[PDB]
Write a protein that binds this DNA or RNA. Sequence first.
RNA 1: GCCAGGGGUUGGCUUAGAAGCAGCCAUCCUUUAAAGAGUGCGUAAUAGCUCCUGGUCGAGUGGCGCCGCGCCGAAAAUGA
Lengths: 187, 147, 134
Amino acid sequence: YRLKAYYREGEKPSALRRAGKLPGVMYNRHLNRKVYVDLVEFDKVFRQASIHHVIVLELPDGQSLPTLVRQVNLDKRRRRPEHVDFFVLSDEPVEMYVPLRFVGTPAGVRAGGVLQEIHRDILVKVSPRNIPEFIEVDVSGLEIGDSLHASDLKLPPGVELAVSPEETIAAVVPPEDVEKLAEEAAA
Amino acid sequence: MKKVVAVVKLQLPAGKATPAPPVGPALGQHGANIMEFVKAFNAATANMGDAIVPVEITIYADRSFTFVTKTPPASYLIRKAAGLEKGAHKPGREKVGRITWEQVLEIAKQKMPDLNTTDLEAAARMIAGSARSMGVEVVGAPEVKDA
Amino acid sequence: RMKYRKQQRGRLKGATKGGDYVAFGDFGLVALEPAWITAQQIEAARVAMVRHFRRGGKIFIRIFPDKPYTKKPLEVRMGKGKGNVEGYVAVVKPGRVMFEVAGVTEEQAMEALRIAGHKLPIKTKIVRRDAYDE
RNA sequence: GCCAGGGGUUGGCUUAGAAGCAGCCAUCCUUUAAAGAGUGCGUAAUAGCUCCUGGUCGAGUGGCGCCGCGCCGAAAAUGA
């Protein structure tokens, strides 16, 4: 996902918003600079990609940079972002979140339940070369009440995690229904 | 060279039969000459075994019927190896019997001469597909083969 | 519950921290107006939603009423309200997520929350998930 | 908008009855350029009309989110 990057300086923060240009910042160990990216362009780019896929940023210098959305500040009250962060990479190992896919239906939902996915992404310490678009998780034999922890995932070559190997990826939860409602509001 | 009136669908065994419902509120309030119309029912189930034959009845324009004996529903071929007399109440979580994808291959050659399906490789998934939504699964070996 | 006794009124100042991001489930329901949601209000929603999709998906009540709503017994001025008539409330400020659903397709988790909002005083706005995480 | 055609299957289960159509559980294939084991009404249960096709037609259409302004919701006692 590419996106045209623009340079901001003294320009007042809000006024940029009145241009549909959401203000922002790129930076890292060897750099710091103010920026501002068009909201519509950003949106289309972000939705699909988010904080997993890497987004290159083209400056008025003919520069292509391998940035990542470290964080993004949103305006509570009508979900809409005020400020974005971009982390410039190089080729040294780096931490970031990677997406998740859960194939097949567990012995839970297939019988009668609901898939309670706790994460949609896991934290990994990996180099800009390796940036897996998804991590397979064979959630087939997950009976109602069981769960798959961080200690059993499809870790591709040279991709060691970053969170506790005891942290839980997700869980198979009980379906709530009306048959409960007689006992719930009862005792 | 013949006249008809209306189509009606009935379910009943082959050979043993009486005017009892739901065949009652059927050929009863419309009249039926079961004096000779049944001498063609005992010659049509003479050497034919028992089952649940839905003879596709189509009331003529002369107050008769087109007794064309068809092949039993795909709910009788599955409980033919399970011995049961019904089906599973929730096809999904519970499993009454676990037949084979082999018994579906030679009980379906009894369901093609009437059904509108050509070869049998398609008639293998019809009897194994109508079994899916009734509470029973199978197991195979050959399959696609391919490369 | 434990806490301790009756608390003061307060003021529904702005929207500041009153606001979130969908954390659990596929869709979401959030508040556009500041207000004092009650217990039985939330309950009025809890039920309706489940009565919609019996044997359906799992519901998450993200907000929680720990503010003692006080009241007075039909007279006048001696002492402060024995209150607790309505019970305990939640300070809900615009942008705040209130009801998360899952295990239900659009048409399900859409006609589920909307109904909720109608057992709800303020105005609401169902939500997808875009991608805005953290 | 119109003309015409409009399978095993009557899905399995429940039920006095549940025939695409009270309730429950679900993910077959075949004639085919097309017809959902099923959108609604209907019958005691059906059939049936309709929300499938080719042609005629002849160029756009359907749905969704947001804004500015307005519309219903809006009934009182001396005359407006």
